[PDB]
Curated annotation (Swiss-Prot):
Entry binding sites for Mg(2+): E547, D667
A Pfam family it matches: Topoisom_bac
Temperature dependence: Optimum temperature is 90 degrees Celsius for production of positive supercoils. Thermostable for at least 4 hours at 85 degrees Celsius. Optimum temperature is 65 degrees Celsius for ATPase activity. The necessity for high temperature for positive supercoiling is probably because reverse gyrase preferentially binds to ssDNA.
GO biological process: DNA topological change
Protein species of origin: Thermotoga maritima (strain ATCC 43589 / DSM 3109 / JCM 10099 / NBRC 100826 / MSB8)
SMART domains: AAA (SM00382), DEXDc (SM00487), TOP1Ac (SM00437), TOP1Bc (SM00436), TOPRIM (SM00493)
Phenotypic consequence of Y850F: No positive supercoiling, binds but does not cleave DNA. Very few structural changes from wild-type enzyme
Group of enzyme by EC: isomerase
Zinc finger (RG C-terminal-type): 617-644
Protein name: Reverse gyrase
């Protein structure tokens, strides 16, 4: 508990309650003034204050009764998939059955209809083939009591039972109606008139053979076709439509789709029932990828007798495939083919009559449309890495090759005008055959350049994955494991393919030696015979909450998003995994903040201590104003088009009921912890199973290792954000008020932290002209020039003392926020805000680690990524694993994947990954180099110390002359200088000017300063500087410097007379220091709130 309040938190009256009660799940002090009562639903009734808590009560009532019904009617308990579907069925929500290959969709459909018939409600269950209509009824009749009115209908019906049904349908108040999809398509109007409380559908593809079926289903749950028409017009218009709130439909359930839900009619489901008819994207694999170093036909035989049965071969072409079919046939192995008998030779291996099936890439990779049995295919062999090959000659070289070359050469730049015959012409006249290849190899980084056969080989990560995933599918709760063995000797191919698999699938392909075959086979076949065994299912649902959609944008990019439930103010995605279902959605920002109105600008004080009072946030989409106070129109532009975060909080309460375990994965700081608390505290009366995880790499690995350090809400971090939020709110309102009563303007003062910085800027202009010293540039003959104290005139430099030594240069530690700002706002024409903004996009997309740190630590994973790159570039022996830091809060800014910035451009223009700009790539490049510089070999050089006498005045100049041994300098370059003989040198020309010893400020110099001085934290660095630009206290010039405006000078000068102890660096640093000790729990929380308070009242008197 942090002793705070939330204005719309209460589970009951839906209003104000504390931070200490809602955690325990109790209603507010008004609903239930009892401290720790025995029951809630009992006591609230005894106080005549029972209101909305009634819903969450009868919810768990009808659920546990439903769960009791299944347990009594059927065998064991519900599965995680079913438990999610059951909670959706009691709320009355329509949804898609997101599930793997037969988890029990047909089974659940009956128990619902039976449990709804027991209540009195009637339903209808639709299946494709009529063979299913009977078996559904066959199990139905021998299950339910005599009470239920079970009727059936199909094509091959009896002569008199056929008519017996249709009269009962039009009349007799039935309970369960089982019929075929054929029935729904033909008997449209009959069904449309009637109404069902529940409608179950098996094969959704059979239903989607027409538009007369979608309209029917919607009318089969109590929706007039009048609404459908108006809804059908708006989805046609180009946007979305909202169903009449007073309309109360039934419950429709559809299964996963085989093909894509293409059309406009399926959009009716999303806007009339708040659910999207999704298809099954099941990227849930557990495969071990091993690679054999060479196409040794003897070694394949060695592996085929390790697997014995259930092996697959993938040859590059039908040629070398037929060859392998000949070779193995002489060794008497049960081996078939696919290029001949696509059907018969397949079904034989399906039985066990054949042990090995040799296939191709575009033959079997295209003939996989039938069944695909993942319980037979245990092993997959790749006789040659799947890829495409283009021969480069006069012609034959594809258009995209001649494009990118001449794009950088210059002749195709004419609006990128594409041509077939013309691009051949451009080649011959300009480039010789040798010149052409040297240009292609110099441009196309990432792919394979085979100058021998004059071919271009580009790895097919798509084909490799599809051929691999045929040995790993989720069958009956258990997820079986397959093994993929690659046979490629061309090291450029194997490395290029391994890169894009670690980019897309994130799966390490390993060498042959570091893999135990007889050990891998065991955990493959044992996993196989466990999938078959009487599974005591253990699949479950999971909810995960982030604060940014961009995080979620890529979260779904590695999970396997199958559907999207637009639930209120947010949109929750759900994917398929081995642990069951997994739900995840974003908050699109914060949720709570201090109320500008009452209290000390949002702070109450009771029982001696301080109490913050929070409210839901509303960010307008038109003007963009942000406020906490509950309003309907934006008090800036009067637009009702607002974004109420309380409609998100209440939205998450609905979803919190459905899922089992809920995890909050936000920004691992104090800002992301404040949000993580406002949500867990909100979903604590609802769910009582909610934990915290902190993600640093938005990938498979960074997610797994985030749950390996799962914890609960650290209140110190929450306290830390509060104290700081209170700080700039209290002081920031006081000082800005002083400006109102002077300079006139309202909102100006951003606080204390941003104002002290302006103090440096005003007094940087002051001590600027103080050091305007005369200097001279001295261009030297045969050697490099240098600058010294000016006004010299003798044209001769005399070497006095010289000494050479062999020093070894070590690189600089990885980027922090202070480092990745300055060294990138320098080397790129960028401001600290734009730099930091690009960084967030690089982290929340899974390209770099956490972009808001102060540590330099690099874990073994970071060091291993570095080495695996140097081993890819060819120089593995220049690697040096540097720990860099013992005390590591977070981890230093580093690339999460061993892929250089040029390999990234290639993947994008190839058509694999996307959503990147050049402003992004140069920021990734700048970091990729720096990290790999900070993880390479040291440079052994040889530098000299020249002491030269110029105009009677000595001077010591140290410079590197030789690089004796290479190292880290391959990434971040090292500047060498020409040698100095111990002779006399003359000056060619002189440039006389007068720069300053004490220079000026830039956007980087500020961050540079407030890091040394100790003012601000990594998150606040980009903000503070840009804020000064915003208010108008600082302007830029020719050199893009930092100077105080006419406004900025008067503002700071005013404060230094009347309010100096509040804006002093020596006190500003003392606050950030103390507040950082609150973050670790060294200085008391309520203590530092009194200290902020004490200085405020003294300020409120001047
Ligand atoms: Zn209440
Ligand atoms: Zn507005």
């Amino acid at each position: 508990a942090v002793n705070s309040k939330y204005h719309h938190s209460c589970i009951n009256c839906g209003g104000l309650n504390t931070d200490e009660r809602n955690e325990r799940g109790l209603p507010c002090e008004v609903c239930l003034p009892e401290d720790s009562p025995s029951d809630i639903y009992r006591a609230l009734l005894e106080r005549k204050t029972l209101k909305e808590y009634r819903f969450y009560h009868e919810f768990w009532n009808e659920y546990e009764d439903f769960r009791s019904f299944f347990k009594k009617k059927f065998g064991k308990d519900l599965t995680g998939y079913q438990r999610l579907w059951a909670k959706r069925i009691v709320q009355g929500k329509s949804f898609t059955m997101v599930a793997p290959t037969g988890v029990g969709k047909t089974t659940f459909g009956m128990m619902t209809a039976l449990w709804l018939a027991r209540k009195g409600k009637k339903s209808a269950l639709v299946f494709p083939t009529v063979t299913l209509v009977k078996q559904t009824l066959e199990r139905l009749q021998k299950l339910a009591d005599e009470k239920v009115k079970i009727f059936g209908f199909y094509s091959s019906m009896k002569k008199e039972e056929k008519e017996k049904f249709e009269k009962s349908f039009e009349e007799d108040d039935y309970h369960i109606l089982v019929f075929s999809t054929q029935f729904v398509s033909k008997n449209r109007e009959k069904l449309s008139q009637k109404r069902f409380d529940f409608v179950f559908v098996d094969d959704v593809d059979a239903v989607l053979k027409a538009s007369r079926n979608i309209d029917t289903l919607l009318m089969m749950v109590g929706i007039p076709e009048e609404i459908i028409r108006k809804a059908f017009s708006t989805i046609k218009q180009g946007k979305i439509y909202e169903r009449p709130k007073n309309l109360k439909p039934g419950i429709l359930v559809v299964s996963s789709a085989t093909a894509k839900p293409r059309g406009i009619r399926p959009l009716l489901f999303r806007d009339l029932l708040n659910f999207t008819v999704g298809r099954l994207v099941s990227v849930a694999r557990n495969i071990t990828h091993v690679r054999i170093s060479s196409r040794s036909k003897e070694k394949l035989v060695e592996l085929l007798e390790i697997f014995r049965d259930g092996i697959l071969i993938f040859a590059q072409t039908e040629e070398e495939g037929k060859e392998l079919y000949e070779y193995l046939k002489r060794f008497k192995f049960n081996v078939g083919e696919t290029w001949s008998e696509f059907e018969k030779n397949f079904e034989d291996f399906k039985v066990g009559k054949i042990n090995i099936l040799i296939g191709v890439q575009a033959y079997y990779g295209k003939l996989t449309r039938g069944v695909d049995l993942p319980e037979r295919i245990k092993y997959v062999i790749f006789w040659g890495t799947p890829s495409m090959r283009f021969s480069l000659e006069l012609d034959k070289a594809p258009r995209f090759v001649l494009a990118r070359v001449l794009k950088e050469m210059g002749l195709i730049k004419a609006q990128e005008n594409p041509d077939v015959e013309e691009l051949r012409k451009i080649a011959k006249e300009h480039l010789t055959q040798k010149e052409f290849v040297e240009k292609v190899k110099e441009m196309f980084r990432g792919v394979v350049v085979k100058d021998e056969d004059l071919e271009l080989i580009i790895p097919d990560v798509y084909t490799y994955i599809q051929a691999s995933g045929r040995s790993s599918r989720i069958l009956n709760g258990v997820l079986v494991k397959g093994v993929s063995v690659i046979f490629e000797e061309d090291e450029e191919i194997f490395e290029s393919l391994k890169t894009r698999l670690l980019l897309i699938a994130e799966e390490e392909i390993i060498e042959e030696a570091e893999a135990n075959w007889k050990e891998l086979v065991h955990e493959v076949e044992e996993s196989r015979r466990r999938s078959e065994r009487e599974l005591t299912d253990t699949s479950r649902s999971l909810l995960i909450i982030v604060e940014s959609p961009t995080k979620a944008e890529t979260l779904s990019r590695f999970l396997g998003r199958a559907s999207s439930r637009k639930e209120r103010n947010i949109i929750v995605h759900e994917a398929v995994t081995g642990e069951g279902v997994i739900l995840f959605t974003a908050t699109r920002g914060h949720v709570y903040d201090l109320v500008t109105k009452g209290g000390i600008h949002g702070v109450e004080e009771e029982n001696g201590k301080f109490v913050p009072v929070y409210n839901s946030l509303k960010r307008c989409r038109d003007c963009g104003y942000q406020f906490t106070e509950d309003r309907d129109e934006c008090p800036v532009c009067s637009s009702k088009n607002i974004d109420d975060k309380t409609e998100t909080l209440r939205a998450l309460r609905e979803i919190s009921l459905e899922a089992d375990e809920i995890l909050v994965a936000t920004d691992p700081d104090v800002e992301g912890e404040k949000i993580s608390w406002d949500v867990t505290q909100y979903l604590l009366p609802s769910t009582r199973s909610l934990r915290r995880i902190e993600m640093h790499e938005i990938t498979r690995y960074g997610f797994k290792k985030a749950r390996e350090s799962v914890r609960f809400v650290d209140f110190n971090l929450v306290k830390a954000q509060i104290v700081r939020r209170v700080q700039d709110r209290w002081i920031g309102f006081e000082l800005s008020g002083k400006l109102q009563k002077r300079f006139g303007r309202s909102n100006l003062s951003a606080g204390r932290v941003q104002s002290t910085v302006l103090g440096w800027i005003v007094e940087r202009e002051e001590e600027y002209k103080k050091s305007e010293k005369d200097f001279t540039l001295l261009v030297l003959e045969n050697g490099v020039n240098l600058e010294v104290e000016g006004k010299i005139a003798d044209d001769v430099v005399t070497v006095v003392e010289l000494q050479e030594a062999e020093e070894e240069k070590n690189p600089l530690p990885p980027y922090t926020t202070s480092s990745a700002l300055s060294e990138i706002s320098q080397k790129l024409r960028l401001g600290v805000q734009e730099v930091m903004d690009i960084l967030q996009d690089l982290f929340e997309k899974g390209f770099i680690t956490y972009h808001r740190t102060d540590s330099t630590r690099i874990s073994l994973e970071g060091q291993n990524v570095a080495r695996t790159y140097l081993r890819k570039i060819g120089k593995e022996d220049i690697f040096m694993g540097r720990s860099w830091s013992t005390e590591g809060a977070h981890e230093a800014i580093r690339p999460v994947k061993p892929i250089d910035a040029r390999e990234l451009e290639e993947m994008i223009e190839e058509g694999l990954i996307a959503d990147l700009t050049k402003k992004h790539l140069r920021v990734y490049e700048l970091i990729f180099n720096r990290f790999l510089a900070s993880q390479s070999a040291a440079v052994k050089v040889k530098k000299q110390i020249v002491t030269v006498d110029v105009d009677g005045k000595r001077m010591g100049i140290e410079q590197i002359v030789e690089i004796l041994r290479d190292g880290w300098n391959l990434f971040v370059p090292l500047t060498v200088s020409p040698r100095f003989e111990h002779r006399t040198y003359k000056i060619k020309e002189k440039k006389f000017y007068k720069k300053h010893t004490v220079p000026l400020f830039t956007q980087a110099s500020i961050v540079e300063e407030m890091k040394k001085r100790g003012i601000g934290r990594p998150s606040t660095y980009a903000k503070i500087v840009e804020v000064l630009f915003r208010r108008g206290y600082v302007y830029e010039d020719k050199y893009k410097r930092v100077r105080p405006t006419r406004f900025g000078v008067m503002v700071y000068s005013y404060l230094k007379e009347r309010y100096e102890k509040y804006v002093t660096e020596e006190t500003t640093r003392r606050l950030e220091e103390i507040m950082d000790k609150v973050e670790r729990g060294e200085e008391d929380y309520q203590a530092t709130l009194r200290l902020l308070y004490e200085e405020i009242k003294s300020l409120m008197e001047e």
